Structures are given as structure tokens and as C-alpha cells.
Amino acid sequence: STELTVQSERAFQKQPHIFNNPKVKTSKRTKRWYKNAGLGFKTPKTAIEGSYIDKKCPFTGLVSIRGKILTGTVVSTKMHRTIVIRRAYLHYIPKYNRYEKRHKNVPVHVSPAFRVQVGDIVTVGQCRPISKTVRFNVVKVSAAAGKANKQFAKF
Amino acid sequence: GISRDSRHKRSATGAKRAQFRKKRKFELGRQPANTKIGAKRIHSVRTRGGNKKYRALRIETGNFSWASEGISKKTRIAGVVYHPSNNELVRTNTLTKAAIVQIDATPFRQWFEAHYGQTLGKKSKNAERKWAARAASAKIESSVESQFSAGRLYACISSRPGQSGRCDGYILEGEELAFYLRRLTAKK
Amino acid sequence: GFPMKQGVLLPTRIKLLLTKNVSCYRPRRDGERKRKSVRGAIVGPDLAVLALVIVKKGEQELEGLTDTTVPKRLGPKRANNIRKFFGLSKEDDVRDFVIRREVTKGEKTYTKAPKIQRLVTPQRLQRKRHQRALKVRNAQAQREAAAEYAQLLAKRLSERKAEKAEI
Amino acid sequence: ARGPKKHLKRLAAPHHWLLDKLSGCYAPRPSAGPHKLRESLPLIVFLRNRLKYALNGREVKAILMQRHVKVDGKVRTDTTYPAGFMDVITLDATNENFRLVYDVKGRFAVHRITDEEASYKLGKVKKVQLGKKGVPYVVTHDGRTIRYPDPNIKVNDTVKIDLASGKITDFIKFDAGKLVYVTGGRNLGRIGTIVHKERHDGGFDLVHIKDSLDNTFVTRLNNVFVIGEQGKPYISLPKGKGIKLSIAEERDRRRAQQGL
């Protein structure tokens, strides 16, 4: 998201130790740093052509994706730059020889490289503790609209 | 003492954590530096593993780096002009990281007149070939040149003075300078 | 029996948290501080003993303050503490100007002199020689091993152009 | 609990030490050293429980203070010194040289080596890096830092180490078709020569290995040690050569050797 007007905070939002020189007259007007996150996750074109900063991005920020790689379905995109996904699974009760449905809500951080809404399947990767509860970071969006644009008006 | 654990601090369900173990030495916190300007005072705090930290408080000289010229000079600090976290640290002149200060503009001016010789604002043999080779390195800026007229440059702190005992920074240039100038002008 | 402490104030008792290297307290543990009773430094009526140091002797002799000189128990031990003690101008072979104390094994009189500490001997010179030697030999050996590593890199750089030249 | 631990109790000791269950509350906690807790051997355990030269731990220290046993050339007079895999233990008295190498049942073996094989050991290079001032260095599986190696030495290779000089004389790469000693896991002590390395980017690569009865098995990389080419090893192998006959073949092997 990030709601462009990117310099929206009281500090100047910049990437650390990325210098773009005022003397050398570069006709791209800003240097950007972006990285490959590893594990075959393709860095999106919104992370290279984007002009946000987002120091917890998996591609343009200082976090590294290492540990578990989970997936989930998105149930809350109301916080700024962090969503909450649902992760449902089955718990085997060994006495009754059968299962029960369980779920867990995981809050993950979502870069402004992706646009996520409620219902989309995301793949997230474990990173360092981002906030009090955020330990994961969106590395793949596996849905775009979940058939939203295919519901227009009549003829 | 100060703790920095999450053994207090209600869980994500909003439940109050029951009180587990007594306060731990390895979850310690300490009091802020609140560095002022003038009359260098630095105390040493014994951290974990020995490994002393240098709690600066009231320091006055810094090592500021003119980034587009490649140099670093030791200069005075005049005062804190802007702070993105708290305006109180602007009011009481407390130096932390990311503060915006006014430094000295004298050794950078003297270096620029030794390196290019152009008298910001407004003889012998080898520096003649030198100042031939430059110039196309001496067209610096409008907005950074015009501060040298005032005898004070805007700068940012980049060292954490409470942990390092230094107030080192760089000099504001380009869009960062335009951003902080838009901040400083439209509050006065 | 509470001892007086220099410059507390205040002629009554007070409980201070005494620390290491501080009078009126000896610590039984490293870093341990202990809160103890201490009378301050102004003389009053509660004192059973004053302690006076004669800075100037008066006209009439006391019993055993002036008339007896108790000797010093030990003499100087370090080399320069003996050279200072006699004014020796450091050539003067301080091994001979040591103080010897004679003791009696009943009917046979032995004598002991202490030890000269920080005294230059052949052993100290030999050890200094070995340390200055090992620094130089070590630096030379690392420079040589760096040189052979550069030789190894060179014979792989002539080698990694050869397989580009035969294709 | 407030700091490092110093006592290792019996029944918490590693099981391949074969310390007796009764008769002792404690077990020798190996010192800090080149190897770890669960993959080493104190010298008291070697000189008393394996070699039976000492009857006590008092006699083990009585031995070790006469400078007799020396591990990897250096004298090493610590009672619970953690001698580990690939170590050369030189007894100058009795003219004996042992190499700590793994049994097929997973135990440290009493394996005598000859006096020329005692002048090198093998080190699996655990990390290669650039040290200060741009000096490359290898770190083997027993903590040795060896500066200026060959640039062809990469990680998971093995290296021959000369044990008087700390230097390298030869190295074997990790390749499909090269002999393997397995050090850890369910297949600790097995041997032989490789099938295929499964990559698994993201953690815990696997190696498929096939001994000389064509019994293929799978281990992780951290248990895999290279010890030479197919056939020819670089070291003396223990008895049994890392085969792991099953329990039926084992009892049929023992009931063959029963004629007195």
C-alpha cells in the first residue's frame, strides 16, 4: 500500500547507505537497492520500479527470509503494511481415530510490492521479529482478485 | 531495574500474562544518555561480556562527512534544529541519532578553497594544475552553497551518541536537504 | 569501639554503605559493600581514644616518644628502591648494597638478604632477545607464505587462460 | 541456570561411551576443546574403559602427568580432554598409535594404526572464509584454522593434515563416486562411496550412499565425511569396514566361529 506521497513521515524516508550523488548528473534521479530473497521467490517489478522505502521489505529492505516457509489465506488487511492470515489444519485426536478442524491466525508483514485483499492466498516466509507479533513476511501472492472483476452488471 | 522482556505486556489475545520468573539480568535496560552540547563528558558503562559502552552526555565536537566530496572534518556542533521523533529534543538541544544540526562550515570551506579555490558564496605551481583538473567538481549546489554564506551547514547525526561516545554525521544534500528545508521553513 | 572516619561530618554515629579501598571496612567478598556504623570526624565527649601524631616536638622530652627509635622492619627490595636509598647513579651494582639481616641458629649465625626485583640479569636480556626474535621471524614467515600463495594464484592465472585458448 | 554447567551425570552421558549404569553417580564431562560433547571421547574413557591400562581415574591422571599419551602430536595432559573423530593418539611407551574411528555399531573403536599413518589426519573443511587482511582460511571439523589453502578447496571437502606442520598436503573433493565415512545419525560408522547428493535449497541436503554389498541408505551432509576414492581409502579402515550386517547375519557369523 504505503499511499504514495511516499515521504509522508516526519523523517526522510530513504534506504540506508544508498547514496545517489548530486554532482554526477544521473538521469534516473534516484539510486535503488533491491535483492533476491532466495528460495526461488521472484522479486516483483513493483519492488524495482517502486518508489517506496519500507525497511521491512523482503526485497528492498533489511530483512532476510530464513526458517519456515508457510502459506495461508488472508483474513485481515486493515493494519498498515501488516495483514493477518488464517492457517487452517486438522488435529488428529488419537482416541476417536479421527480429526478436528483447527485454525490459527498469524499476523504477517506485507510489503507494498504486493497488493493483498481479503481472501487471497499468500505464501509467507519466516524472518526476524518485526514487531510484537509479526514474524513473517509476504513473499508470494497466489491470488489476484478471487473472481471479483468477473462480477459486473447485466447486459 | 528496567526490563525489556515480554513477560509483562499482555498477549495478542489481550490476556494478562501471569507473573513468571523474577527480573532477569540479561533482560536489563538502562537510562538514556540525553547528550547535550558543550564540554565533552563521556562515562563508561560495563555491558555484557565486559565490552564497555561509552555513554556520551554533553559532547561538542563531531566528525561530519561531506558525502559528495568524499571528506570528513572534525567540527563544532551549534545546535539541534529538527528531530523527527520529538520536538522537545529540538527545544532542549539533545543530540541523538537522526537529529538535524548546524555544524561549523569553516573547515569544509577551507578545504574547498584548498581543493578548488572558489570562495563559497559571493599561486604556486602544482595547485595550478590541480585547480585545472577540478572545476566540473566545483559546481556543488544552490542550496548547500547558500548555507556557506551563513557560516553554518545543515547536517544529520548518524552515530548513536549514547552507545558510541561519538556524535558523527553527514552533511545534508539533495532531496534529503530539500525535505528538511520544507520541514524547517513551514513551521517558522 | 566505633572508629572515626575522615570527613563524614557530624559528631554522632551514622551508618554508611562502605565499599572497597575505603577505611573502616575490609571486604570478605569481591565487590561486596556493607552498611556499617561509623562515627564522624568531630571530637566530642563520646570518644574513648584520640589518636595524635606529633608533627612538631616540644621543648621537654616525653617518656618513650622521643627517647626511643623503633627501627624499620624491612629494607628496600626493588633495584631502584635501593638505588634511591643510597644515591647510587645507576652503574653501582645494587647487589652489593643490599641490606642483610643476621639471624642466629642458636650457635651458628646465618644471614638473609631479600631479593632484587626488576634487576637486569642475563636471563631478562635473553627473554627480551627471544621475544624480539620471534616477532621478526614470525613476520618473515608470514610474508614468505603470502608470497608462495601469490605464486599459486599466478600459476592458476596462467592456467585459467590456457583453457580459453584451446577451445 | 546462572552460568555454564560443569558436572555431567551418569545416564546423561553419551551412550557410545558405554559407561556402566550402576557404580558411579557422575560421568566425565569432556572439557571444552576441538570436538563437542556428544561426538567425542574423554581420555579417561579411552585409557580406562577401552584400553584398560588404568583401573581408576586416579591412575589416568598418574599416566597423563608423565607426558605419555599425546593426542594429535601435542601432549594434552587433560583427564577429560575431548579426543574425537580422526584423532591420532600416540603412546610413545608401548609404541602404539591409535586412530579414533567409528565402529559399525556406532562406537569409538580401539584401532591401532602404524607409525607412518600416525603422521597425518583428515579434516572435513567446515567453512572456508576470508580472514583479516584478505587471508583465506579453512576450518576443519576439529576447529583447526589453516591459512592460505588451495583455492579449489571448497566446503564439505576433506583435507589431509600433516600434524607436525599444521599445513595441508592433499585434499579430496566431494564428488559422486568417492568414499565416505558416516559420522552421526542412525547410520553412524557405515562406509561407502556415494550414490547422489540431493540439493534441497533452504536447508538439510541429503546424500545417498551405497556400500560394498549394495545396501543404499540416506544421510544428511553433516554426518558425511569423505575418506577417499572408491576402493582405495586414505586411512586405515577399522575391522568390519563399515558394512552393518543385520542381526541374523551377525549371529550366523558368531556361530560359525565357535569351534574350539
Added chain:
RNA sequence: UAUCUGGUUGAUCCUGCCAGUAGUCAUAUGCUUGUCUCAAAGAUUAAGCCAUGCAUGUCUAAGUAUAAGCAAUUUAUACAGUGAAACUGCGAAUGGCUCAUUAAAUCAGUUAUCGUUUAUUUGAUAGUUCCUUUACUACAUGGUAUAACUGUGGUAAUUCUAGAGCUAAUACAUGCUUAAAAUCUCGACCCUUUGGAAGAGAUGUAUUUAUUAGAUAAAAAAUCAAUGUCUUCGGACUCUUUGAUGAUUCAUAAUAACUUUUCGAAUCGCAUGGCCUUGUGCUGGCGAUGGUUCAUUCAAAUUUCUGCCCUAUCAACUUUCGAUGGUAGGAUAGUGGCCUACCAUGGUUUCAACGGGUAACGGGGAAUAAGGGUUCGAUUCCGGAGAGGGAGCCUGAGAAACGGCUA
């Protein structure tokens, strides 16, 4: 090791419980008690209270020996053997005990640190230290300031101690010597060009900041800002050097400086040999301690996933005075609302949140033997927590320590 029997009726067949029966590494208690091996034991209730004693100290050839201590002999008039005391180093943060708290907490299996500290051990690792570089600065080696000790004392009392006089160091505070170069900056001069030149400084490591390099996706060109090697003076430039990971602003290097400037051996025992300019000249072995940085080990701190008993006569909880998230700062060993400022209104929940109870420390395990289960786990191992209840802290690598301190 897949078992049933007695009791409702005048008698019958049922549902159904009561009672019997068998075990208990499950406690108590009664009667009884000859032998061998094995051996739990103040858990339940009072994590209630404690007299007394003990449980943590430590010295090798190798830190400090003038004990006015002992042994006196055998080369020692500085010492040189044994060795109390005390200084110094180290440990005392291990062990041992208990189970009060504690219900997503602890813990178990599994992960991560590209998010950190680490004494010790183990392996590597430091020629640069001073000074506008001919009248220089101890390096054959620098300064006081104490302990034990002697002597004078105080108090009813103690692991209480004051005053006075000596004297050590691997304690404390200081301070030098080491190559030759390469590369940078500046440059006394002239000579006018496509300029070319002595010599002055800097140049370890550590901290802190900023900038740069840290290449690789396969073949060809043109311009502009500076200047570089060979010059057959049009201009060519031919060969150009580079590790790791899945992944980095990584390792590492380079530049400009910065720092109440860290470290770079004024230490110890045995051996005492080799050279000639004979100066008590230069050199010289084994190993003891200590020390910078890295790696390793011993760990630690956080952390991913999944899993806990009963309760709805607990259905809404969280934001009070952080509750969920963003930005910036502080703090930390470090990530992080851990804390502060500004901002946003989020976060959990019938898949049981939140509250309550637990006569609840969790696990490996224990009892019961058709299969499935059911109950127990204070207790020999692992992990956690606590030392009467709370809190605060010194020392240290490591403690929020209680056989440490403060309230």
C-alpha cells in the same frame, strides 16, 4: 493377558445399581517376622519455624617469601630448600535440595540467529607504538602505595577494626625499540610541454561515521567529465583482477577523518649451549603465564511450527498509565511496543477467546495386561522456578546470586 458371582419376586426374564473378586513403583496402619541379594524413605499437611556442628576453597620447576618459622650445609653476601601469613590469579553462577508460583506460560519434538554475548579449552593471529625525523627520549628494563609483619589501641559483643612505622608483584598506574618497500596526499623548482621532479608527511590494530569495490545473462559501437601504460605522435590499449550463500548493505578490501586512543610482553622456571672485532659483546633451546582479532568448544539469550486438565451458574475480552500496527529515537549483548514521541484503529473470539478452578511444575515415564483405553507422574534423567515474602544491586565471561550485599 478376551472369565464373572451374591442381592428387588411366590417364582420368571430384564434394566439397573450396591456388594463381592484381582492388581497398584500406592500411601497409612494392625498382628507377625528366621536367612541371602537388592534399597525408597518429612513429597502430600506447614515453600511452617530452627538450637548446634559441618557442607567452598585453592600453589605448581614455572606470579609475590627477609615468617625476628623450620632444615642447616654445600659452589652461591641479591635470592636460590621446605614453607605459615597476606597480596595477586582463579573458583565460589557448579553441585545439592524443594515443587510454592506457573494453564500457550513452563515443557516436548522441531526450527532460526542474514538478530546476538560468550571466561575457559582448541587452532590460527600483530617488524609500524616517540618525534616538523643533527645536538632526543631510561630499554642493561621506569614510579609510588599498600597487605602480611612490628608497635600502640578502642568495644560487653562479630570473620569489628583505627592510628603509626616498613616492604613486593603477572596487583596498580606508566613507557620505548624493528625491515625494506609500495601507494597516497601535499609539494622546494622550471617550462612552457604529450609537462617532470627531488623530499616532507601519512600509512598496524581497535572504536565511530560517511563513501566505494565486493564482477559473471551470450555478441558489436559513439559521445562527454578527469587522466593512464606502451609510444613507428594517425592514435591503439591487445591479456585485464574477484570468495560464500537459497539469500544480504555478507566475508574482506579501499578512501576521508574521528577517539578523555583499546591492544601491540618492563612477566616466570629450567636448560645453559654456539660465534670473535674479547667487549662479562652479539646470538641461542624447551614451556609457563598473559594479550588483540577470527574460528572452535562449553554455553547462553531470544525464536518458527504443533501439542495441555475441569469450567458458559465465565460470551465477549483487549486499549487504565501499549492494547494491535507504522515511522523515528532511546535502550540492549542484540531483534522487538522493550520504552518514549507522533500517527493509524486495530488485535483475540462458539474451531471456546477472556475470566475462574487446579487438593497443576512440564516431559522421559508409572499402574492397569484382548484391542481401544483409564488413572498417575512432588520424587534418581532432561528442562524450568525458588531460597521466609517482594524489590534493588555490586563483582564477574556468566547472578538480578541469597552457605553475596542493601532496604
Added chain:
RNA sequence: GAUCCGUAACUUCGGGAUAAGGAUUGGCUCUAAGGGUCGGGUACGAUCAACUUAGAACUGGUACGGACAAGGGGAAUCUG
């Protein structure tokens, strides 16, 4: 007085209730938020004018609704 917190039995569910019970309050110097009008072919800037609320530092013989003004409260019984 005002501001902020916290409020019980009972109830005709409207109340009780300013329940009960607590804290703050000056001066000075700052900070932040809340506005009006003008020109955009078919993202902002100039300028002008308000007292309201919140916060911070400093300060004093701990004082501050500084005079004035300005509820005592609760547990019940009889009764309308």
C-alpha cells in the same frame, strides 16, 4: 467551581447519581490541533481573522476555584 477517574443496594429500567470515594488547578515560556476569501483549459499557494482544547519545560515559603462565589455525605423506619 471546573477537569479527569470511579461509582453501590434498589429500580416503575426512566432513575438513584454531583451517589459514595479520589486526583489536578497559579504565573511564565513554548508546542500541537480545530478556520475565511482568492486565481486552476475543456497537485498546491498567497493572504486574513478567531478563542477553544490538549501537552511540555521552567518557576515559588506546596501555593494556585488563593477575595468573591460555592453540595456535607451515608444505613434505614413511619408516612404522603
